[PDB]
Amino acid sequence: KQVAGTMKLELAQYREVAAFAQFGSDLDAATQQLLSRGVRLTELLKQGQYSPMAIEEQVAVIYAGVRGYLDKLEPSKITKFENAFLSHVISQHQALLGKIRTDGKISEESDAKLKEIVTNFLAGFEA
Amino acid sequence: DIKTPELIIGVSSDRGLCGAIHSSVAKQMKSEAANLKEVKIIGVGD
Amino acid sequence: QLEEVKQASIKQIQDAIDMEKSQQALVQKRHYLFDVQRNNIAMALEVTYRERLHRVYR
Amino acid sequence: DPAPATTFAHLDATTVLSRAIAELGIYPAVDPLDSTSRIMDPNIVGSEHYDVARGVQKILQDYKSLQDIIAILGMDELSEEDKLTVSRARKIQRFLSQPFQVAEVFTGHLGKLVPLKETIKGFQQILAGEYDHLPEQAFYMVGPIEEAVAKADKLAE
Amino acid sequence: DPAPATTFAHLDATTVLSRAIAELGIYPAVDPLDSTSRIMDPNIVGSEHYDVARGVQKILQDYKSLQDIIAILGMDELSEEDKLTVSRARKIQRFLSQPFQVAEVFTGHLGKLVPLKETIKGFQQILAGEYDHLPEQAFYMVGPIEEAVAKADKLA
Amino acid sequence: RKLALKTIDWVAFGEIIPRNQKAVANSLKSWNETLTSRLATLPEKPPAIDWAYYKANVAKAGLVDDFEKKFNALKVPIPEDKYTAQVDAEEKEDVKSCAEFLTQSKTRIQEYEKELEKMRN
Amino acid sequence: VGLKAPGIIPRISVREPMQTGIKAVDSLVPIGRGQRELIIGDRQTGKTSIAIDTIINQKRFNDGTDEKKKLYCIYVAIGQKRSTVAQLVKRLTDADAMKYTIVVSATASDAAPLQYLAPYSGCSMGE
């Protein structure tokens, strides 16, 4: 619920911004972001054929985009990242995963745990 | 006649829903643009 | 007068910063690099022996 | 569909909820320019109501006409007076939207309700084109108009 | 039609020859957004195929979306990347056009048969836009991409 | 197998003043990640076989036994080290870094800060 | 099979989630348990896949020891040729999520009532 509410909403505009002031071609950054982000979110939900998953992970990765953290990157790398990020968290932030799963929720702390983690992961993705 | 070893600007309409006016200029400004020093472009119309 | 004061001030701390940033990095990151790869090396092989003990028994 | 078609006969007040509008996300998701009571009156609902509705209904209908330009010919773009109406309609739309009062569970929007005059008035103000300095989304999903005004403020951040 | 509708269930590979396409002259006349194969999978037949295809399927799919707006508008005031891609999609289309060895009488054209690799290659290339500085019809009734190349020369 | 471990360090990557490897580290880490994920994936172990019961349900029960002994007694050798100079051709190139670049770098620094002091004066 | 549906009273509505591992699903049309929801779509879009991956996904839950998420899976195959089905079974098998799974299969074959009946059957079995 924590990411999704917002996301749903965001996607709603995102999808929407395909229709008002677009049937297919135009520009402005504010909104471009929304698109970018959106595109990302698309990937982020884009879950190829064959994919059983656990929700916190899902949230985990989702969180990254929602909380705007990869917007930057191209879709192509998302997936890759996502994967990568996954073994990383899986391994490391297994702790964290433990928690999030536990809390049924992400605590603010766990969030923070994400924040650095993700940022860093991204960074690690480089850095 | 005038010359320089050196305002590339194009003129377009604000709006489309007309010919390849845009396309042309768009094209042909860029078509130039490599060649020259003080590369800077100005666009009238959008 | 005041110009020269600042000119050496810039150049001097500039070479202080850049050299000290070079020094600190090199140790750790190179220490880094050696252990990272070893890591990678070793890992692979763990798997490779193992997997097989599966594969085979299967 | 013959059935509803029949049904209609019996009905004296019809609420036709518009799934398209619903798809436009709203909740008020209704069809409005179809959701009638033949029993709207300049007498009985008084003319104020009546007219307001009729004007409104009209503008929406008009607005609809404008749709025809816009889908392929512009969407923060063409002629402007019509823009004025467009926006106005749009506000009206948003203002027409009102929070759901139990699907706050879902929405988090506390439902609202506006007794009639403040409403009529409400639209009249909008009609009066007051809030034009003011812009759209402030109007969305509200009960009375103040709440929209308030919402504007929150939005100015 | 229910009959085919049912049939699909039993299919595993569906061949839709597509009259529209046929009208585009093409023999091959298939439409693979229709002609699909359960066994067409990133699985069964490689993802390369799939993906190269997905881009294609996509591009086409998009294109398919476009032709109609374009039908009115042409692609004229509609983004060039699209123009490119469209054309590419089409080229790819054209590149799929393939002579019939059997029906050389019918075609005139002399059959082509293309092993997989050159197939992959083909799309990958066209996809690379590498090819694209080229004529659409170059891609027509080709064999391997070379033949398109050959043809390009022969054109221009 | 079984193999131990060092975390990413992006600072490291860029610097390699053995120029002939500058690119390699960026690529080489990513090769690593291939192993990293791959190892995290699999377990170490299958199960084993209750040959007694399987002999009950194989009428040619001799086989179960024969393959049993050979397999269970057998141990195949861990994919074997060929390289261990990594540590070394580093830690020596880390001295290459330190002493060689440490000293020169620190001695330069001193002259800078020495003129500044008097330039603050 | 012909046992009719219970009353109001023997129910308690949902308040559990139901998870599929499918990000989108779980998020955007978030589902609970005891529910009913249409998978609507055309052919082998991994038509089935959708179910499958979900089921596989439930594996971890079935690897949980819950009964809140430990979910016994029931697959009604209507009209689905054995081959398809075979693959399918196989898929589950491979996933061996099958262990917590009934697969009720009225393939393509089956005299019509048979396919007809199957759901009801599944239904009783599920009740």
Swiss-Prot record, chain A:
Family designation = Belongs to the ATPase alpha/beta chains family.
Function as written in the Swiss-Prot or TrEMBL entry: Subunit alpha, of the mitochondrial membrane ATP synthase complex (F(1)F(0) ATP synthase or Complex V) that produces ATP from ADP in the presence of a proton gradient across the membrane which is generated by electron transport complexes of the respiratory chain. ATP synthase complex consist of a soluble F(1) head domain - the catalytic core - and a membrane F(1) domain - the membrane proton channel. These two domains are linked by a central stalk rotating inside the F(1) region and a stationary peripheral stalk.
What top-level branch of life does the organism fall under?
Eukaryota
Kindly provide the name given to this protein in its UniProt entry. Answer: ATP synthase F(1) complex subunit alpha, mitochondrial
In what way is this protein post-translationally modified? Acetylated on lysine residues. BLOC1S1 is required for acetylation.
Cellular localization per UniProt: Mitochondrion inner membrane; Cell membrane
List residues binding ATP: Q47, Q49
Positions of post-translational N6-succinyllysine modification: K1, K72, K80, K105, K113
UniProtKB/Swiss-Prot annotation, chain B:
Give residues where N6-acetyllysine occurs. Answer: K30
Q: How does it assemble?
A: Component of the ATP synthase complex composed at least of ATP5F1A/subunit alpha, ATP5F1B/subunit beta, ATP5MC1/subunit c (homooctomer), MT-ATP6/subunit a, MT-ATP8/subunit 8, ATP5ME/subunit e, ATP5MF/subunit f, ATP5MG/subunit g, ATP5MK/subunit k, ATP5MJ/subunit j, ATP5F1C/subunit gamma, ATP5F1D/subunit delta, ATP5F1E/subunit epsilon, ATP5PF/subunit F6, ATP5PB/subunit b, ATP5PD/subunit d, ATP5PO/subunit OSCP.
Species this chain originates from: Bos taurus (Bovine)
Where does this one sit in the cell?
Mitochondrion inner membrane
Residues annotated with N6-succinyllysine modification? K30
> Which region of the full protein is contained in this chain?
81 to 135 of 298
Name used for this protein in its record:
ATP synthase F(1) complex subunit gamma, mitochondrial
Q: Which domain of life is it from?
A: Eukaryota
The text of the family note is: Belongs to the ATPase gamma chain family.
Q: What does this protein do?
A: Subunit gamma, of the mitochondrial membrane ATP synthase complex (F(1)F(0) ATP synthase or Complex V) that produces ATP from ADP in the presence of a proton gradient across the membrane which is generated by electron transport complexes of the respiratory chain. ATP synthase complex consist of a soluble F(1) head domain - the catalytic core - and a membrane F(1) domain - the membrane proton channel. These two domains are linked by a central stalk rotating inside the F(1) region and a stationary peripheral stalk.
From Swiss-Prot, chain F:
Question: Which UniProt keywords are present, listed alphabetically?
Answer: Acetylation, CF(0), Hydrogen ion transport, Ion transport, Membrane, Mitochondrion, Mitochondrion inner membrane, Transport
Name the domain of life.
Eukaryota
Per the record, residues carrying N6-acetyllysine are K29, K45, K60, K69, K75, K82, K92, K114
Record localization: Mitochondrion; Mitochondrion inner membrane
Question: What are the N6-succinyllysine sites (modified residues) in this protein?
Answer: K75, K82, K92
One GO biological process term is: proton motive force-driven mitochondrial ATP synthesis
Q: Which GO terms describe its cellular component?
A: mitochondrial inner membrane; mitochondrion; proton-transporting ATP synthase complex
Bilayer-crossing residues are none
Q: What is its main location?
A: mitochondrion
The entry lists its GO molecular-function terms as:
proton-transporting ATP synthase activity, rotational mechanism
Q: How does it assemble?
A: Component of the ATP synthase complex composed at least of ATP5F1A/subunit alpha, ATP5F1B/subunit beta, ATP5MC1/subunit c (homooctomer), MT-ATP6/subunit a, MT-ATP8/subunit 8, ATP5ME/subunit e, ATP5MF/subunit f, ATP5MG/subunit g, ATP5MK/subunit k, ATP5MJ/subunit j, ATP5F1C/subunit gamma, ATP5F1D/subunit delta, ATP5F1E/subunit epsilon, ATP5PF/subunit F6, ATP5PB/subunit b, ATP5PD/subunit d, ATP5PO/subunit OSCP.
The record's similarity note reads:
Belongs to the ATPase d subunit family.
Q: Name it.
A: ATP synthase peripheral stalk subunit d, mitochondrial
Gene name in the database record? ATP5PD
Q: Which residues of the full protein are shown?
A: 4 to 124 of 161
From Swiss-Prot, chain G:
Residue positions, PTM Phosphoserine: S13
Q: How is it modified after translation?
A: Acetylated on lysine residues. BLOC1S1 is required for acetylation.
Provide the binding site for ATP.
Answer: Q44, G46, K47, T48, S49
Modification type Omega-N-methylarginine: residues: R33
Q: Where does Mg(2+) bind?
A: T48
Q: Which tissues does the record link to its expression?
A: Heart muscle (at protein level). Heart and liver.
Compartments, record wording: Mitochondrion inner membrane; Cell membrane
Q: Which residue stretches, if any, does this entry annotate as coiled coil?
A: none
Residues bearing N6-acetyllysine? K59, K68, K69, K90
- Domain of life assignment: Eukaryota
Which sequence positions carry the modification called N6-succinyllysine? K59, K68, K90
Q: Report the protein's function.
A: Subunit alpha, of the mitochondrial membrane ATP synthase complex (F(1)F(0) ATP synthase or Complex V) that produces ATP from ADP in the presence of a proton gradient across the membrane which is generated by electron transport complexes of the respiratory chain. ATP synthase complex consist of a soluble F(1) head domain - the catalytic core - and a membrane F(1) domain - the membrane proton channel. These two domains are linked by a central stalk rotating inside the F(1) region and a stationary peripheral stalk.
User: What is the similarity comment for this entry?
Assistant: Belongs to the ATPase alpha/beta chains family.
Q: Additional info? A: The siderophore enterobactin (Ent) produced by enteric bacteria binds Fe(3+) and helps bacteria scavenge iron ions from the environment. As a consequence, the mammalian siderocalin LCN2 plays an important role in defense against bacterial infections by sequestering iron bound to microbial siderophores. LCN2 can also bind iron bound to endogenous or nutrient-derived iron chelators and plays an important role in cellular iron homeostasis.
